[PDB]
Design a protein around this ligand. Sequence first.
Ligand SMILES: *C(=O)CCCC[C@@H]1SC[C@@H]2NC(=O)N[C@@H]21
Lengths: 247, 673, 261
Amino acid sequence: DPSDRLVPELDTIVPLESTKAYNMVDIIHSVVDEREFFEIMPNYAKNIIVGFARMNGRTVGIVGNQPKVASGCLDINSSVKGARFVRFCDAFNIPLITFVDVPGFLPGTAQEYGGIIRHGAKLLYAFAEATVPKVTVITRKAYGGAYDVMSSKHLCGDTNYAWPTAEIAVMGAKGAVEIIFKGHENVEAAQAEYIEKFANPFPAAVRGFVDDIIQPSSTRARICCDLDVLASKKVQRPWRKHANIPL
Amino acid sequence: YDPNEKTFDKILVANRGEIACRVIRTCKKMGIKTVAIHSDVDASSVHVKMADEAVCVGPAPTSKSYLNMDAIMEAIKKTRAQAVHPGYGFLSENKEFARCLAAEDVVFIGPDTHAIQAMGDKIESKLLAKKAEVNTIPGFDGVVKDAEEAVRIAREIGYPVMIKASAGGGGKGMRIAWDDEETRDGFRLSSQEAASSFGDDRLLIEKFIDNPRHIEIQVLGDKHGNALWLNERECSIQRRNQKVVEEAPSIFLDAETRRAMGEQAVALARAVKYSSAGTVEFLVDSKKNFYFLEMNTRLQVEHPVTECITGLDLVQEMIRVAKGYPLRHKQADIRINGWAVECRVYAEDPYKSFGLPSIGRLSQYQEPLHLPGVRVDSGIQPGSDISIYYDPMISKLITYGSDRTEALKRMADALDNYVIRGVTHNIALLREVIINSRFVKGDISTKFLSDVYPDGFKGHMLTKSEKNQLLAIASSLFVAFQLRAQHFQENSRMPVIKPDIANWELSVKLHDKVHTVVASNNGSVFSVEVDGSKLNVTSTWNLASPLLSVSVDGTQRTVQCLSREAGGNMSIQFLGTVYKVNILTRLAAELNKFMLEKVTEDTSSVLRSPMPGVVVAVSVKPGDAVAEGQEICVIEAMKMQNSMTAGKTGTVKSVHCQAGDTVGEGDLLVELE
Amino acid sequence: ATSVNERIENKRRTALLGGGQRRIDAQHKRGKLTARERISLLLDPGSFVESDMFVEHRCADFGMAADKNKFPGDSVVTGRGRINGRLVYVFSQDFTVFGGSLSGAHAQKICKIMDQAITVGAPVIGLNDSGGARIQEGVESLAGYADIFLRNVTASGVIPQISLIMGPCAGGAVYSPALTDFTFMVKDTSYLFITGPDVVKSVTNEDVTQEELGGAKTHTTMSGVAHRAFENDVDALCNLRDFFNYLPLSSQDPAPVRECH
Ligand SMILES: *C(=O)CCCC[C@@H]1SC[C@@H]2NC(=O)N[C@@H]21
């Protein structure tokens, strides 16, 4: 399996309008070697995908958001399952690839009484405490604290990419425009300017938050390049007996 | 050709698919600006991207997307294009479109509306054919009120043929004509049936077309009175009155019959003052007596095969004669160059109902453009989506050679080397039809697939030698994967001791039998013993390539591996057909005997909502049919709409869902049978 | 004309007065007290050394670069002090100016104080009441959060961290006390939730209040997010002080031993 083979079927995998879903497993199958993917607990917490695959012969752990189930929002079970997978993968020297498409967390009183703060902190800790090389691809959207949770740049990230369909923001456009310009009523002016200025990766690309905006059909090759350079990665951290994970 | 000649500046193509791509390619060759139109769903199509300018027209449903007269006229006015090519289908034969477009001083690449209207109605077209001194069905067209009249017509116009009854057919007096007894029998039966329903006791005697063959003559004619015939085509292999394979030259008719058909078609085209291109369709019986069937005044789907025999380009010649330039080639210039065969590959299952359409998305798509004497006419690319609103056509393969056998061999090679993953296609049916016994000799009729397959398509029945070859290939592939699973990198801390296996003993479950295999490796050559039969398999054993070329003891085979599991299951596309096989070792073969058979229960006919939400709209109606993959209803939740697809086709017992209703998790929506 | 010393004095007492006396009066009528008062009530008298007092946010977009919304310090007070003689680092979020929402400067000051604490080997106390993140800043604010998170995960098991929330924390801010070793609340004037009751009503349509969905009772009786609840601010600070007396300063140091009778 050549490392520089192209994936033209990924150019239009993400639908143009944001209310329609797509299968994230198709992207993973198209990217990994020979389209072979060992999936872990596939029938539990289907909101997220974790599994083992190979890139250029090297074993890689895969974490991805599933927009088909619950819109891809983070949860209790999703957080715990992803956290345990990431912890094993980082403990046994296995690189990580994550595919982010998430609007936030599931609302409701059941999640709030169940302690979703603790489990969200579990997933955030797992991503931030990892030392193996990790690569993130933003396909469509990453809103709010979910963007920081799901392997952001500022959590000691290594390589971060965005497809031309990616948009990164603190929240939805409508809510932002109705909590920024509230004193004076606006008709189609503020909404249009905010949409044409912030519904795109550029506010994150101008600040160096993403390395580059790449074409989808060239994703795999680029990943295969980054790992080839990142295998020599070593970091140092302050001495510590063991840490206090929010279990 | 010389592009320096004064031609049009901009051409707008009013179609979609592969015909749009062909027209765009020809226009680009000619050095002309091209404008395309597309639906909203077709924003990323190939013809949209190749054309210089693309203008959206509207929604996805073609009933008011590609037939919007006003939108197309507005696009013409906006783009300032002075000519339009309608291709075939849609608005190519539309009087209203032509009359609306003639008002703005924009030329139409196609025949004048007089030809369209004179071919629209059957009675006046038949009268014109009578005027055009072209032979038709010699069938009687009068009245037969008694049996003696039937025998009189029988002895007057000849009686080898099936009977007709003017108003009424298919059992209404349909008798095989060899003697007067069936005259009387058909008379009484048809008279009784007419007195019941039809009312006309008259009878007719239309000459047979038993064992019919469909012959097409391609005619090209400018507006100065010059017309040319471009040889013939045979399109006799059909399912649901749709052709699947065509061949331009025909072994049925000799030179004199070909000349007679050409002269008659040219005379008919001249009679109507034809322009651009058209086709004349005859039916021929077993005695080489052609009978007129119709005249289609439009470019045909199976046109390019004739191109391969004559070297012409129909699109450029017709766009040239659209401006008024007389055609160049004379009648003596046209000739026959070799043989050509065309196969249409669709997106449909060839096993169930003989071509049920299917929808999906292309996981990966490759075509054999490097093979000799092969051209591909397609309008799809990898990642393309097969929609329910359009024709499920995928591509057409055209293969030319010096003679029929070379063309058929090259077509089989091309079919075996053609990758379509993501949807179901009909490659197996075409691949099996090409190597049919009576197709090769030339005994093709209109009822080919009807009587060759009384019980429907069942795949390719592989003989004992081919069965042994398939078993050997599968065993060698299993061992190749097992050997590749041993190659690690150097650790230098805990070295890997490579296991040594002299030979691999395998139990291979195929169809309903189990075979015993002994496989040995000597580098890149596998020695396989299948029930005492020795075979040698050699290949490069590139495990990542979609194609795999192996050489089983001399014979070269091309195979594809579609699926593979750790439990021993494989799916092998071999000779065009997909075979499911189970592979195990000895030890697992005896240890699997003690394993209790877990009974599996599946329904696949009850629809359950996985997440709570609100049903925006129901896209189905009770008492209909749904394809495997077609979405039934859409439910929105958290502002995202989720499409609930299907998994089978069945009868809807009841519908428990309505539009605008809020449903929870696990709620019952649709019950099938 | 005017000298720079008078300008320094003007900046100084603007920073001391916070966002104004009317907003301080509103804060006191709400039932709670200010950030400076919290710091003075938690630390020993005269041991607080404020760090990096003069900071103004850098955001010229959306017309917020005018002089009407320039606030030195930018909604957080950071520094180092001593409890019973032992050194400690403290940050207290100010709800008066811009609602205590995170900005670039807010996060920068907190990150600097955390870096100093990790270098020296001293614990951190955080006093939280923040409305979330700025929408005017936009993408710049989220990054700030991530930085804080990293520091938290970096210091876990190295120095003890204490979180005490005295107001309505919402959004991603709620994830900073979660990584902290211990989290204490104050009754009737403190909330914690990722999503507010209005989005909950819009999406899953249950009628809830802020107390029922994020109150101290909820997080100390059924969710297990907080470790203790205190009646008001003063006794919460007293109990924070003696709990601090229990703990050591860093994992290098052994567990403290006190003179006993
Ligand atoms: C409707 O009001 C717009 C979307 C509602 C909030 C959505 S829902 C799931 C995500 N999690 C979150 O906190 N906001 C997002």
